[PDB]
Symmetry: C5
Subunit: 257 residues, 5 copies
């Protein structure tokens, strides 16, 4: 799946690619699960080699944040929910070269789907690959903050089930919920920590235009403010786990009598 976009008065406009062949006009090429036809197309029409599937699995800093003849690379985790409502992080490879952004990903993602909806009716400022990459990160952070906001309200409800329920039915269900919330928080944190590394890397490496620099700093400031929330949930979740076991042991004593 190849989509391509070009700039028209600081507005991202979707190029037609199946028909209008010239990719050279694009500022952003976005690949989703691309076949070897789409990869070869990008290879010949632009200069661009793209990361292979197994190289997006690598977690080492030097494998994720680096510069080479193929440009500036940032591999970042993006958060999503699979078909059965289970959280995950999918790695996305960002590459910037000759003022163009390339995004390569294994799947559809809510930050991208959201950015693209908005991009249809919203001007960029400086209008360049770096602003665009940071815009995708801004959107990612906005969505992680929503996730956290939801863990809070779910944990609030679940806290009351744990104080007020005693049946076994309500309690199997409670530990499962707790475990699902821990997992989301955990994945959210991986997502934040990685974005944070990525942004620190760019601040030191790219000659980011000054408008971009402030933007990146704003994003770093948001991450600094969400991480503590993450840690706060893990304390609550662990405490609730402990309390439940307490209630189960008390119940068991009742039963034995």
């Amino acid at each position: 799946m190849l989509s391509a976009f070009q700039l028209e008065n600081n507005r991202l406009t979707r190029l037609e690619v199946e028909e209008s062949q010239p990719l050279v006009n694009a500022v952003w090429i976005d690949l989703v699960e691309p076949d070897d036809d789409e990869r070869l197309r990008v290879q010949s029409e632009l200069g661009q080699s793209l990361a292979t599937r197994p190289e997006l699995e690598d977690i080492e800093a030097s494998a994720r944040f680096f510069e080479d003849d193929d440009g500036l690379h940032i591999h970042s985790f993006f958060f999503f929910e699979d078909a059965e409502d289970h959280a995950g992080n999918s790695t996305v490879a960002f590459t910037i070269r000759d003022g163009r952004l390339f995004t390569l990903r294994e799947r559809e993602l809510p930050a991208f789907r959201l950015y693209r909806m908005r991009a249809r009716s919203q001007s960029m400022v400086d209008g360049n690959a770096y602003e665009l990459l940071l815009d995708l990160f801004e959107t990612k952070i906005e969505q992680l903050a929503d996730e956290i906001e939801n863990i809070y309200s779910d944990l609030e409800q679940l806290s009351r089930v744990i104080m007020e329920g005693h049946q076994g039915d309500e309690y199997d269900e409670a530990l499962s919920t707790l475990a699902e919330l821990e997992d989301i928080g955990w994945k959210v944190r991986l997502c934040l920590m990685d974005t944070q590394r990525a942004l620190n890397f760019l601040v030191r490496k790219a000659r980011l235009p000054g408008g971009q620099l402030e933007q990146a700093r704003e994003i770093l400031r948001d991450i600094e403010s969400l991480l503590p929330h993450n840690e706060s949930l893990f304390q609550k979740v662990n405490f609730l786990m402990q309390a439940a076991m307490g209630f189960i042991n008390i119940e068991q004593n009742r039963i034995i009598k």
Copy 2:
């Protein structure tokens, strides 16, 4: 619910608003669950758009602490107890523009009720929106310190109940109490951490008059001194939880014999 206040020799005096229409004389406009009539009134009489309900839910730094054409914004958690004695944090949107403070909130709050009682018979110093915002924060911290002081004495009593035990139904009751105290501490900490971000933001952003700057620093110094107390209570609470489970297991062994 719209209340408005004005200054008379550095004393906050309540304006009559249902009758005396001129709001322009007010230094502080305080809205509680305002209908669209009250919002429109503020909009036309002063320049002021106010945050919507869903924007007070956003927890990201950039959504809470920011400057724009509508002024300087600080969204801060305030602590309260709902009808059934369950702790919570309610977000309050502070806005300062043209030397006036606007507070927008979802509910009545004890810090506000307390500040207002005192404001009746107590002079301000410099007499301005920034002092006023910091006064509300001073008051908030004073109350969070009281909360913590109370968790201490409650935990002290509950500690003794747990050493006797010697179980039914003194022990169901003991874990419930523990769990209520953990939750208050937890919510107190969120409240402190957020006030701390807000105050760090203001120290860097507003041209705070020097009298205000010291005031802000004093409040930050207090938060620095309360956070450790918070962390201390979690250690105790977690240990007590562990001990109780110990006593329950010992009891269970007795029963089985």
Copy 3:
């Protein structure tokens, strides 16, 4: 209970007060649970208002370490054991004004009782309110170190009971002891952390004579050296708790067979 002391060749000498009325000659006035007669006496004979009972309950920094027209104030936790051998921390309000020290406290305290015994036959160096305040702190630290030393030996003995006992009688008793030791350590730590704040405050605030400054630094160095011991005991205590539960579960399995 009002006692007063005066200096005679750098020696603190108890000046009889029921008879010899002139309090002006005293360097140190020490009140324990003073009635309104003793408070009024200090108020009229010296310039001195004294903190009320509820103000000694406040735990925020600005309520404990501050300067005002009534002088320099330090409120510090002191460690003690109540009638039923339960550890506690009692707040003592220190005030220095016009070269005189005022101590106000709710109860007898072992540091004070000890300092006073020694003061009968021991010269001070510079002979002033600040030295005197730091001497009381030195004594406090000496006693907290003794507490910790004792938690170690008690925990050593209890460690052996936990490996070698199996009866239920010996194990109720073991968890209780553990819980008692955790509580002492916990209260010791609060006592240290607070003294540490107090001393940091003085180092920056009072024009401490240079002999006093070194003294304060020595005390801070001691606290830096006791805090780690405190943290070490919590690890042990927690581990022992876990082991005991292990033994109880093993025992329970034996019983069921």
Copy 4:
């Protein structure tokens, strides 16, 4: 087992040693479980004493990272899996002297086997003992990152077994798996922490050619980026352990009824 290598246009080429005796041409001598014949050979043909078996067991810094008349020594843990699929760390003694690298090890190791396979068809840059040592470390890190990547996917699967399963068969198996994953992470961390010390030592000690210095820094940057992942897995593992016990206690209550 003695292997030796020499440089030919920055390409490591395996010398024949059973036949072609001259070892003086080698840049790298690699010993695996060497007999006293192979040790004596290295001793006489080059100047080189080699660490004894018990000296590779010493874990203090001064025993692992040091310079002496026999050259520059680095003893580093390398990760492996024994015959029964149990993780372990084997110490390898690196020595550099007169532009030659000596590696002494107790066993075959996957980093070495991998480096050697690649070395057959891949040019070095500067072509020296220090580059070579850092290449082996680069390889080691690449493999530790693979390990961590695998703990993640295994923990992902195991997380779902723990939420969905009730049978005892699936749960014995689940704790065992958890315990195996904890042990790998644990050993991976020891391996990283030690490599980190080693590289910090070299950065301060060897006159590393500038191309090597950047290489070492790149490796340090990767370790800084993997350690947090390690800590993240322990939190998950510990939580899952707790949850499982919860489910077992719930099951036990069912059984008793």
Copy 5:
């Protein structure tokens, strides 16, 4: 028990003290559980008052690392095993005054026995009280590292045991014994670290000694993390075992 040593070409040689009375020639006086005769002897023959029994119990920095008219004092924990193989830390009072080292201790200790064995047949470098004190510390650290090395291999074996029986009472006991050793090893390290930081700032240590002290500090910095790593493992194993016991209990009930 009074032993005394003197220097002969940078070699520590044991003086005869029951017979050859002159103590003034000694560089190192080592007392173990000394009676008031041996204390008075040191008091009169040299200038030296020695710490009392209860003052070696004090754990406050100011009670352990300090300078006064009786010289430079360092009280440090040393690791040992009592008669029933139970780990402990015994405080040793080091005092340096007029180029002489005094050690006062409650008991025999393996670092001291080891140092003395070696001191027979091994030259010192600069040959002074400060080198001698640091040599005793070097030896102490060498032994703590051995302890940790052993907790590792024991924990490795015990890990496998933990993956019906009488084997499980035994396993928790072993775990608890290993936790205790690690714990005591840490106390020993943390204290030595405080002592060495104190000396670096306080004594006019000759430059050869300064590097020596820094080497020792570097070793401690490298052992402490190992200590913390073992507690994580030990705590986890404890948790796992309880898991297995609960699973077993469920089997039984069925």
